[PDB]
Amino acid sequence: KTAVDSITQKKFLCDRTLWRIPFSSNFMSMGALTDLGQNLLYANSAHALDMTFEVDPMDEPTLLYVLFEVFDVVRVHQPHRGVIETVYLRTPFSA
Amino acid sequence: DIRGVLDRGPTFKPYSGTAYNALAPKGAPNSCEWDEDDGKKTHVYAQAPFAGEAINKNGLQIGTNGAATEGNKEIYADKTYQPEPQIGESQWNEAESSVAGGRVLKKTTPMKPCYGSYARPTNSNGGQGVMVEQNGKLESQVEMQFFSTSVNAMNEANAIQPKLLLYSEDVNMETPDTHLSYKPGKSDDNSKAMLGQQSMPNRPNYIAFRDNFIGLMYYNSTGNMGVLAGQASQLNAVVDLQDRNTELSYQLLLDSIGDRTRYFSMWNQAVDSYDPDVRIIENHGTEDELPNYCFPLGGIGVTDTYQAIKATNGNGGATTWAQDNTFAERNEIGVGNNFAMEINLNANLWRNFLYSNIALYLPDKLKYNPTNVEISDNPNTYDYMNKRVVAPGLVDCYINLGARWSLDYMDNVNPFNHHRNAGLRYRSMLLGNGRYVPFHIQVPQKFFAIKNLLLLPGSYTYEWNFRKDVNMVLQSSLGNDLRVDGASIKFDSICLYATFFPMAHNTASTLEAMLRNDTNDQSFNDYLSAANMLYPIPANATNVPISIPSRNWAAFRGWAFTRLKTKETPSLGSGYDPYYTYSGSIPYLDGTFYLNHTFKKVAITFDSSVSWPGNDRLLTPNEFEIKRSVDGEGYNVAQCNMTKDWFLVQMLANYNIGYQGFYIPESYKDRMYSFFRNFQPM
Amino acid sequence: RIIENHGTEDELPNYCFPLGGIGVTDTYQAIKATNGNGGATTWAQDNTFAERNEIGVGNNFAMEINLNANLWRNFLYSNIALYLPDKLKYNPTNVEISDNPNTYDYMNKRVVAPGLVDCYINLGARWSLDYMDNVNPFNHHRNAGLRYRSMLLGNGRYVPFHIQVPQKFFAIKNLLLLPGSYTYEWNFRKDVNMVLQSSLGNDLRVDGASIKFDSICLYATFFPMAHNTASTLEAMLRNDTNDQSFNDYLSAA
Amino acid sequence: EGYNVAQCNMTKDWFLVQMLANYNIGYQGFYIPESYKDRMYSFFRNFQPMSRQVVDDTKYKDYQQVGIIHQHNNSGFVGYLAPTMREGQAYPANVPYPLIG
Amino acid sequence: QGVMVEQNGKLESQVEMQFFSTSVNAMNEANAIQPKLLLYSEDVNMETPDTHLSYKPGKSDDNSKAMLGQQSMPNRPNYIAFRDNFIGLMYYNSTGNMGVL
Amino acid sequence: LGNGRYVPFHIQVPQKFFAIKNLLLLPGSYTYEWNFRKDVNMVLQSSLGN
Amino acid sequence: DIRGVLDRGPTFKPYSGTAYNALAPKGAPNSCEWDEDDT
Ligand SMILES: [Ca+2]
């Protein structure tokens, strides 16, 4: 009978995972490659990238971890006896 | 294959609580004695549990032999091991005897509470007197003391007889695993008050090898990139860079290709996990509606003597009464309910659990230093963490009652660095609970580029490296540095094993020939397949820019991100770091993360003037919203703070679900490190 | 729902103890043995030790209790006993009680003896009581899902809430719908008996709980299909040979 | 000191044999077999390795053997070789040897 | 629970009333001889179903003051049932009584 | 079987032999004869092993 | 299909602990009275 006036608060926990945004036209996964990536505006072009984050403050130096999923494939060829050669390659962002 | 020697140092605490006089009350001192002024006399506090037969100047008589000489010569106490603290009466009433006895520590031995007091044995019968060398031999220093009543001296009973006897000895007192809660005196000399100091066990701490032996072998880093190559090639066949977390890689992949809940011994495969109850407090409250009562050992305390009475007929008047002769004149009865005590049970259990599992792990900015105790100044060592003060009133049965919630202080603290971590307990116990372990392991290859190659006959050089640091290759529950405490390790024997197959000769020849042709080369990709960038953030800031100049964007697949707490995040590239002190569970390699719930928004742009995906795809014009705090007009979902749009995007990109109405995705398509599995709204 | 009685494992008694770890003691005085002059050994009061000391004789005084039986009895009383039908109770003593047999108080103020169910009922037999069969087992605080739902809103009393409701009618829960312009109007309920639910089954209209809507809105999505393909599908999906069939699950009278 | 495997007293080769005969697994590097292939009575479900440490009796010169009927811990609060009424007096313990600190 | 015994061809009881006052006032003046405690005594078929005596003071059997110290302890549980799949009900693999279809 | 000293019991026992467990039988008349144990040890099981 | 009557005997006990004045302390006696030889 004698409770008080109150307010409400909400939040959530999503540990043990990463936030992933795919590079797809309609966000759906339809193969290892992707339509926008395959278009690249046809790769006679190039582009510069800007990204902006805004997060709540803490009280300690922190790190922002960002990774771009790209292609990283290696081909192995061993022609003669006791000889092995390989070719790595990866894109974009590689060398 | 590796064998060698490992020493964990002093700060290894496998078992919670303690195991030295566990049942004793946490404040009662044991038998002892100390000194006072006028005039320096000695006060003694003890108790004699064991009865005997008789006393004389040579000691206590505890038996006799018929076949002896002096009538039946009296057998006395061989002070070495006589009346032992583990003997006593044999029933609750147990009519009192005439002469008793016991043991007592002398004043020279420092006082300590009973709860957690250990002294090693000295002779084969459990004696504990400090053996001392006299005259070229070993001998003991037991001293017998005698006592009689007080009023004994007050009257003509001058025939004062020795009624009580004690044996005084010295021991090597040790308290391996507890500290002192309260200590009134700054000095250490045993006062009278020093009979009140109470103890408290040290917080438990597990230490072992990390999951899947992560960190043993070098990897992503020119530190010394290992080499597999042809025996006379003189040209390498393996190239690695410095932005390919090979490890996070092997990691997630295991996940996928199978199941993780089952542990496998050989590779120490035991995923770090946290109990659901530790993270979120399901404060249903206690359960009690009945009283609980302890009782006297006889179930009747008081007693009033009484007397049998027989009714003699009062004829023509009031009945008369006389004393019976059949009964004994004195009998004992009681009136009313037997005296007892009340206590709540469930509330105590719940309170113990809450205090032990959550309180001690609170952020350290809410703990104040203790009183009258020494302590270190380095805020990282085991000592400084085991001797702070935590207000139990901060969390008790009356916090967030009947709600599904987590204490907002805790949610920015690594929940995996804990002591209920089942995987941690498994790994720690596998090596055993000692302090000096000769160990023996087998390590798997993890580089994707050759972890599934099919080599062909020949000769090759296979050369690799391993780390010696103790900060990284080990794991500690409390995360305290180990360079300071100094756990050591030394490898001795390292050997390699390989497993061929018994294939028929000509078949192997045919396959090898068919496989040497160039149009049958092998291909591989890493399951992760990504880069690795990291960006600093000064404390108490809000927003971060990132800009990469003009370049190509062939076949780019997309982004993923999260957050990390500097301190605990080895820098990488280099083969060693003097600055790494912490030693919790490294999020950057194990796959544990806890910071995700702390984002507001993120925006993406090409050449600073074109949005993406843009063209009015989403509800907001040009910015991804993750959670707007309260003011949000129509943009929450599932009673959380998350926007509908972000929820939709995550659902789609994780399972291709959403355009046909949401619903729980099926099991196999949602593994341990999925999204939906770990989505707790509160 | 069913009781697996076993007794318990309580073969070692448990004793509590005094805070000093020793019961009571009787001041005593030290002595020493003045050497027996041939005959009786002489005894002289010492001076080294003070005139008073504390010493105990025999075991320390210690009250005692059992543990497991008490826990089990508490569980049995608080999970089963309270839920018997009313006809096995009586009004309490000297306190005004509720007169309506539906509201909260009449479900609370009543008193049920332990004697009906204790640690000695159906000793060791997987079995369920007789009076309990015809009483629902879902209306019970031990429920998990109900507890989760109750926590989801929160612990308060005056709560602002904001949710979404999925359409459930079979005939349109999966239909498609080519382009057009149609009307969707529906009606929502407002009684507290229906929408809400109580773990005890008391009435809620009498106890004054209520609810009121403020604003209400409708959402929806699409699939950014390329225009021409959508045109082709729209044209194809109109040849009456390609009607759509639907059938609810249960289907019956 | 050549052939122990999986942190136990069992040699590697026997492990290889059992894994083969159960699941035809081993020429492709050991790994957890799939759930449906392994049932209740199978081998890998019932494989429990354990180890412990005990006090050496040659290095620790102070060590002395102690019979059961002289050991005493939690004295003055429990029985004596029988679950009877509590007995004894308080005192420091004499067992077991500590392995930490 | 009082024992019933037959006399006069009928089954009756053997409850007796005994009276007690304070020997506590054993000594003093007359008149003040008033009872304060009434006890009803009986005899009952004492019977223990599932307990055994852990402690016993003396090898005798009569009722002394010492006998109050005796301590009891429950009997270990002992389950009994049919085996799994009724193993053993039907003979097999024995030439003595091979079944016939 | 409950927790009684005396119990009336009433059960069904399957057929375990492999030579007839999955056989498909054909029309006709046949003789079917078998045996059962009465020993109290083998049929029963006791937790303690007494 | 089989029907019969089975007797486990006396030594069948399916419950840990006991069910008779269980809460009472394990040494407390009962209200009694006994004879003693006069002195
Ligand atoms: Ca009295």
Side-chain angles (χ1 to χ4, degrees):
Chain A
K1 312 176 180 179
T2 66
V4 315
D5 315 339
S6 65
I7 56 185
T8 58
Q9 285 165 0
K10 316 180 170 302
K11 63 189 184 190
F12 64 97
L13 308 171
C14 197
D15 30 331
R16 233 176 169 190
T17 158
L18 327 176
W19 302 109
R20 38 164 82 268
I21 286 193
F23 192 7
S24 141
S25 175
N26 62 27
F27 305 139
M28 307 201 60
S29 289
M30 299 185 296
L33 218 76
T34 186
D35 21 333
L36 309 178
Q38 191 187 337
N39 167 30
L40 0 75
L41 312 98
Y42 287 6
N44 216 23
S45 49
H47 284 315
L49 169 60
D50 285 348
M51 292 175 58
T52 296
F53 288 93
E54 215 176 353
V55 328
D56 282 341
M58 315 190 67
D59 47 1
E60 188 168 21
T62 54
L63 294 189
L64 181 54
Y65 188 1
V66 173
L67 20 77
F68 328 121
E69 321 96 34
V70 301
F71 279 95
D72 200 15
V73 201
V74 43
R75 184 178 178 89
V76 184
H77 170 23
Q78 34 168 334
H80 298 350
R81 154 153 191 78
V83 164
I84 155 172
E85 236 286 43
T86 44
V87 175
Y88 300 113
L89 176 107
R90 120 207 174 146
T91 143
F93 271 145
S94 182
Chain B
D1 213 3
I2 291 181
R3 287 116 49 179
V5 177
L6 172 63
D7 185 1
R8 284 184 290 207
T11 160
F12 164 80
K13 189 68 227 305
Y15 59 87
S16 165
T18 169
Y20 288 147
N21 294 323
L23 298 156
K26 308 195 94 60
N30 35 326
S31 308
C32 48
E33 58 176 24
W34 74 117
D35 310 323
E36 300 180 10
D37 288 2
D38 202 328
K40 285 194 166 185
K41 306 214 180 197
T42 289
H43 299 43
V44 182
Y45 188 163
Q47 55 171 23
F50 180 49
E53 310 164 338
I55 319 188
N56 51 21
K57 80 164 194 170
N58 34 323
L60 168 56
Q61 176 218 18
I62 40 192
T64 19
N65 161 41
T69 299
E70 315 162 327
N72 282 12
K73 296 177 62 182
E74 289 191 339
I75 299 184
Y76 295 92
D78 179 8
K79 53 269 174 183
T80 57
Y81 74 110
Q82 295 293 247
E84 302 173 357
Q86 61 189 190
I87 327 179
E89 319 292 344
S90 297
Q91 55 187 6
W92 72 294
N93 42 333
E94 182 64 42
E96 312 178 11
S97 61
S98 75
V99 291
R103 310 181 81 93
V104 51
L105 320 183
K106 303 186 182 182
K107 58 187 187 178
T108 62
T109 279
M111 280 185 182
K112 292 294 186 179
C114 177
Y115 179 73
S117 337
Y118 164 80
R120 67 192 192 175
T122 45
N123 78 79
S124 81
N125 306 8
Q128 5 223 162
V130 179
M131 279 295 191
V132 190
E133 183 170 19
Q134 297 179 349
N135 319 10
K137 302 179 180 177
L138 294 191
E139 276 165 332
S140 173
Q141 311 310 128
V142 191
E143 288 176 350
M144 315 212 303
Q145 309 171 351
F146 304 75
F147 302 91
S148 292
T149 105
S150 301
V151 354
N152 250 185
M154 92 157 17
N155 258 80
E156 223 162 274
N158 335 298
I160 54 270
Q161 286 288 350
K163 191 171 181 174
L164 211 46
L165 167 59
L166 282 193
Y167 302 85
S168 58
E169 57 186 338
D170 306 334
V171 298
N172 332 11
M173 176 61 54
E174 280 178 331
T175 52
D177 39 327
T178 60
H179 62 180
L180 315 177
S181 59
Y182 169 56
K183 178 181 177 185
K186 301 183 182 181
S187 158
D188 292 357
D189 299 11
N190 343 30
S191 95
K192 173 204 171 187
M194 295 296 294
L195 295 189
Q197 44 180 14
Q198 324 82 310
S199 181
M200 171 190 180
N202 308 341
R203 292 170 52 177
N205 188 48
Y206 296 101
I207 264 194
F209 280 105
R210 276 166 184 273
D211 203 337
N212 311 321
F213 299 71
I214 286 189
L216 291 192
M217 311 164 63
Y218 260 127
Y219 268 111
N220 330 0
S221 147
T222 122
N224 29 261
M225 231 165 356
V227 163
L228 153 64
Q231 220 273 5
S233 44
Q234 291 197 352
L235 284 182
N236 178 13
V238 179
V239 174
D240 189 5
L241 291 194
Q242 204 203 265
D243 44 297
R244 219 214 258 89
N245 198 298
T246 320
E247 260 300 350
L248 183 40
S249 111
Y250 180 99
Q251 268 284 42
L252 312 188
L253 172 78
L254 204 295
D255 155 62
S256 145
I257 88 119
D259 194 341
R260 280 311 301 276
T261 60
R262 315 178 59 165
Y263 321 98
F264 184 49
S265 82
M266 176 170 182
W267 315 112
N268 293 10
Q269 299 199 18
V271 44
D272 312 12
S273 73
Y274 63 98
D275 185 296
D277 318 3
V278 189
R279 181 67 146 163
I280 300 186
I281 297 165
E282 182 82 359
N283 183 5
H284 276 138
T286 74
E287 262 189 2
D288 68 321
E289 288 84 353
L290 318 182
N292 299 261
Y293 294 145
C294 25
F295 288 93
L297 277 179
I300 296 182
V302 247
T303 1
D304 296 350
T305 325
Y306 276 110
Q307 198 168 354
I309 53 186
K310 52 184 179 184
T312 289
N313 56 323
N315 310 20
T319 337
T320 52
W321 302 83
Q323 172 204 191
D324 162 77
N325 321 339
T326 304
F327 295 105
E329 63 157 20
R330 301 157 42 85
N331 272 243
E332 42 273 27
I333 333 183
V335 176
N337 309 325
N338 40 5
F339 144 88
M341 328 273 308
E342 185 162 286
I343 167 190
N344 183 298
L345 269 155
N346 298 82
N348 260 76
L349 250 180
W350 177 269
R351 191 159 171 274
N352 285 265
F353 163 80
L354 292 210
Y355 181 82
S356 184
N357 295 259
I358 305 183
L360 306 104
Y361 299 119
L362 278 158
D364 207 278
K365 76 182 180 182
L366 303 194
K367 291 170 168 177
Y368 55 83
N369 307 15
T371 314
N372 293 24
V373 191
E374 232 284 354
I375 201 175
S376 158
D377 297 21
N378 163 280
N380 287 340
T381 145
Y382 179 80
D383 177 79
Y384 169 69
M385 274 179 179
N386 200 95
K387 283 173 184 161
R388 292 284 281 187
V389 186
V390 37
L394 240 192
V395 184
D396 201 336
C397 310
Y398 71 111
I399 185 55
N400 282 335
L401 185 49
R404 203 176 198 275
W405 190 266
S406 70
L407 319 179
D408 308 15
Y409 304 111
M410 250 314 292
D411 288 358
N412 295 13
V413 167
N414 187 331
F416 295 91
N417 293 328
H418 192 257
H419 87 263
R420 282 235 177 190
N421 178 288
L424 234 29
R425 183 137 54 202
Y426 189 110
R427 306 210 224 110
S428 185
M429 290 187 177
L430 266 206
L431 296 180
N433 57 350
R435 203 245 201 180
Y436 308 85
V437 177
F439 75 154
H440 181 5
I441 63 172
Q442 305 82 347
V443 189
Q445 161 59 260
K446 292 177 166 191
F447 198 1
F448 87 102
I450 68 181
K451 74 174 177 55
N452 291 115
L453 192 76
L454 182 34
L455 193 53
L456 292 187
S459 300
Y460 318 85
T461 42
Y462 191 12
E463 171 172 354
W464 214 253
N465 288 319
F466 307 96
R467 297 207 204 90
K468 268 190 173 184
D469 157 81
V470 296
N471 273 17
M472 299 215 301
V473 318
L474 296 133
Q475 170 166 28
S476 62
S477 68
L478 291 169
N480 54 281
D481 164 29
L482 306 190
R483 282 162 179 161
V484 157
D485 308 6
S488 106
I489 170 187
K490 184 191 59 183
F491 306 89
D492 315 319
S493 57
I494 165 170
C495 307
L496 171 53
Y497 285 155
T499 314
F500 282 141
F501 175 93
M503 184 178 296
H505 282 255
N506 50 16
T507 317
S509 169
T510 44
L511 174 57
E512 172 268 359
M514 192 172 298
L515 240 173
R516 284 197 167 283
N517 197 329
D518 82 323
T519 167
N520 299 336
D521 295 325
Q522 280 90 308
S523 62
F524 284 102
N525 78 308
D526 137 61
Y527 174 58
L528 172 64
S529 73
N532 271 313
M533 339 303 312
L534 284 187
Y535 292 112
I537 298 182
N540 308 66
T542 78
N543 55 344
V544 178
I546 32 187
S547 174
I548 346 183
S550 176
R551 67 157 54 253
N552 186 292
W553 284 97
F556 171 44
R557 307 170 51 180
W559 304 282
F561 46 42
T562 182
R563 194 185 195 165
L564 284 187
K565 172 188 312 268
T566 310
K567 243 204 345 175
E568 23 155 29
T569 293
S571 128
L572 242 194
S574 169
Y576 177 89
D577 162 46
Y579 293 64
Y580 213 43
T581 79
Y582 143 107
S583 169
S585 117
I586 314 165
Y588 177 64
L589 302 181
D590 66 5
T592 57
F593 304 85
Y594 44 68
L595 295 178
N596 300 340
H597 69 337
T598 45
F599 284 98
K600 287 207 59 179
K601 60 177 55 179
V602 39
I604 312 176
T605 303
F606 284 137
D607 297 14
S608 67
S609 54
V610 170
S611 160
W612 192 101
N615 318 79
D616 201 327
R617 283 301 178 277
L618 297 184
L619 293 181
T620 46
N622 41 274
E623 43 183 359
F624 287 75
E625 288 190 1
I626 327 172
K627 54 164 191 174
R628 52 204 349 179
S629 57
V630 164
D631 28 333
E633 193 35 72
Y635 302 86
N636 277 27
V637 38
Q639 301 107 341
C640 150
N641 330 29
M642 182 180 312
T643 103
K644 292 179 204 65
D645 307 13
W646 181 264
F647 185 63
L648 160 68
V649 175
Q650 282 304 329
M651 287 305 302
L652 280 179
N654 203 130
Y655 308 97
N656 290 279
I657 314 186
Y659 289 112
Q660 310 314 120
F662 315 86
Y663 58 102
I664 34 185
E666 306 164 346
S667 303
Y668 67 100
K669 274 177 65 177
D670 182 296
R671 325 214 62 74
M672 180 174 294
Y673 323 155
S674 304
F675 165 81
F676 178 78
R677 177 88 68 175
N678 307 341
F679 181 79
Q680 312 281 4
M682 302 154 315
Chain C
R1 188 57 155 163
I2 45 186
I3 299 163
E4 288 207 26
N5 182 19
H6 297 64
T8 10
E9 358 196 6
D10 53 355
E11 294 65 273
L12 314 182
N14 314 326
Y15 314 102
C16 70
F17 293 98
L19 234 172
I22 293 190
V24 273
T25 145
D26 290 0
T27 318
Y28 284 140
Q29 335 173 306
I31 71 183
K32 63 177 170 301
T34 305
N35 62 323
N37 296 332
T41 311
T42 32
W43 301 96
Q45 174 177 4
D46 184 6
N47 64 341
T48 318
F49 306 106
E51 313 169 2
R52 324 189 60 77
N53 284 267
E54 284 279 43
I55 312 185
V57 192
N59 319 340
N60 43 16
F61 147 81
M63 358 186 53
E64 170 255 60
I65 194 184
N66 180 284
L67 264 175
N68 284 329
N70 337 35
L71 304 138
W72 162 274
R73 183 160 167 277
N74 255 330
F75 162 62
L76 287 211
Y77 185 89
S78 184
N79 287 244
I80 303 186
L82 295 173
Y83 289 132
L84 282 195
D86 162 86
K87 75 174 187 177
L88 294 187
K89 288 167 182 165
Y90 43 52
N91 313 18
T93 308
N94 305 350
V95 180
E96 169 150 353
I97 203 178
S98 166
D99 32 335
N100 159 44
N102 273 339
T103 166
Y104 185 23
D105 301 54
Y106 185 71
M107 296 190 185
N108 197 101
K109 307 279 190 174
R110 299 274 277 173
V111 153
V112 42
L116 294 180
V117 177
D118 304 288
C119 50
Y120 54 76
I121 181 57
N122 302 323
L123 178 60
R126 159 178 285 255
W127 171 279
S128 70
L129 290 161
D130 325 0
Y131 323 87
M132 281 304 301
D133 290 353
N134 310 334
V135 189
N136 157 264
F138 287 83
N139 302 323
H140 189 327
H141 70 278
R142 268 289 181 163
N143 177 288
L146 199 48
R147 243 139 63 183
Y148 179 94
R149 306 227 236 91
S150 177
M151 294 200 168
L152 251 192
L153 265 198
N155 51 8
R157 171 174 184 172
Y158 311 81
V159 186
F161 77 134
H162 146 280
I163 70 157
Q164 329 88 178
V165 179
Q167 154 63 273
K168 315 177 62 184
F169 202 7
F170 87 104
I172 30 194
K173 66 181 269 59
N174 286 79
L175 183 94
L176 295 174
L177 172 114
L178 341 165
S181 266
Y182 338 90
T183 259
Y184 202 172
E185 142 178 338
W186 210 306
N187 320 57
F188 292 142
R189 235 188 228 119
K190 234 169 15 170
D191 134 90
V192 288
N193 305 19
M194 311 301 295
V195 277
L196 314 174
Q197 188 201 16
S198 79
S199 48
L200 276 186
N202 68 325
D203 174 294
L204 296 199
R205 298 168 190 186
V206 187
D207 315 4
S210 57
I211 168 183
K212 178 170 47 193
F213 313 102
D214 348 309
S215 78
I216 169 168
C217 308
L218 152 76
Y219 274 132
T221 332
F222 290 130
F223 182 160
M225 177 165 301
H227 269 190
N228 51 28
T229 304
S231 164
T232 294
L233 220 71
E234 153 70 25
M236 197 178 310
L237 287 158
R238 288 196 172 277
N239 306 271
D240 54 354
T241 169
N242 309 340
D243 299 332
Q244 290 163 133
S245 72
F246 277 143
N247 45 341
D248 87 79
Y249 197 122
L250 176 64
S251 327
Chain D
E1 201 50 33
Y3 311 97
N4 288 63
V5 84
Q7 311 153 341
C8 138
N9 65 332
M10 164 187 307
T11 141
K12 323 199 165 62
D13 58 350
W14 176 268
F15 186 87
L16 192 67
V17 152
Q18 298 313 124
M19 291 305 306
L20 283 203
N22 285 263
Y23 321 110
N24 293 283
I25 295 193
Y27 293 91
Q28 298 302 280
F30 309 87
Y31 66 116
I32 304 170
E34 308 183 10
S35 323
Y36 87 100
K37 274 170 54 186
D38 155 81
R39 319 218 66 78
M40 164 180 306
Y41 286 55
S42 36
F43 162 85
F44 175 78
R45 183 78 58 173
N46 300 25
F47 181 87
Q48 308 280 51
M50 316 166 317
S51 304
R52 78 176 186 178
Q53 302 86 338
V54 299
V55 39
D56 183 306
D57 57 354
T58 60
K59 294 295 187 175
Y60 185 72
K61 40 177 181 176
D62 321 9
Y63 161 69
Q64 294 209 17
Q65 182 192 17
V66 174
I68 168 64
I69 71 180
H70 296 63
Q71 289 129 22
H72 56 67
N73 192 334
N74 289 253
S75 71
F77 302 94
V78 285
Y80 175 81
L81 310 185
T84 79
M85 183 190 63
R86 57 93 200 76
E87 28 182 341
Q89 62 162 132
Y91 206 67
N94 59 332
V95 115
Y97 290 72
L99 305 174
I100 49 191
Chain E
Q1 344 186 15
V3 171
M4 297 302 176
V5 187
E6 191 190 16
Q7 29 60 69
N8 328 325
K10 299 186 176 182
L11 320 174
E12 275 72 21
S13 158
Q14 318 292 8
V15 170
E16 304 165 7
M17 304 202 300
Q18 313 185 14
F19 312 80
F20 293 94
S21 179
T22 59
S23 45
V24 336
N25 206 156
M27 51 283 113
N28 255 31
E29 104 104 325
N31 317 88
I33 348 278
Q34 290 304 333
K36 297 147 201 170
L37 279 76
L38 178 59
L39 283 198
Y40 287 111
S41 49
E42 21 193 355
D43 194 341
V44 288
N45 308 89
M46 164 59 55
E47 203 188 42
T48 67
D50 41 331
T51 61
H52 74 326
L53 316 177
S54 66
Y55 176 91
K56 198 155 180 182
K59 306 156 200 167
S60 156
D61 279 352
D62 306 7
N63 343 25
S64 113
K65 185 183 185 182
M67 294 309 299
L68 301 196
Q70 59 190 11
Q71 314 192 168
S72 178
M73 164 185 166
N75 294 319
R76 310 167 68 174
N78 180 32
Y79 285 131
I80 263 190
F82 273 131
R83 300 175 166 270
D84 200 340
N85 327 91
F86 303 81
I87 281 180
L89 297 195
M90 314 171 56
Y91 274 107
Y92 304 86
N93 309 95
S94 184
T95 73
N97 333 77
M98 195 181 311
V100 165
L101 151 64
Chain F
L1 303 184
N3 48 13
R5 150 134 168 164
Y6 317 99
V7 161
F9 71 142
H10 147 75
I11 38 163
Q12 313 80 350
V13 173
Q15 166 51 260
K16 290 182 172 179
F17 206 2
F18 83 121
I20 71 181
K21 57 186 280 77
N22 298 12
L23 166 73
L24 190 31
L25 192 46
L26 297 185
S29 311
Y30 309 94
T31 296
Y32 199 7
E33 160 173 324
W34 215 270
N35 309 92
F36 303 112
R37 299 230 196 84
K38 299 173 67 174
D39 150 87
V40 295
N41 321 14
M42 303 261 304
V43 306
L44 292 162
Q45 177 165 27
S46 73
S47 48
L48 290 180
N50 50 329
Chain G
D1 187 356
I2 304 182
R3 280 159 52 183
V5 173
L6 178 63
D7 182 0
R8 317 191 189 191
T11 114
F12 146 57
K13 183 184 187 307
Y15 63 104
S16 304
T18 159
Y20 294 97
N21 294 334
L23 280 162
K26 269 132 185 54
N30 308 261
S31 310
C32 61
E33 48 193 35
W34 72 108
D35 325 12
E36 301 175 33
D37 44 355
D38 188 10
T39 82

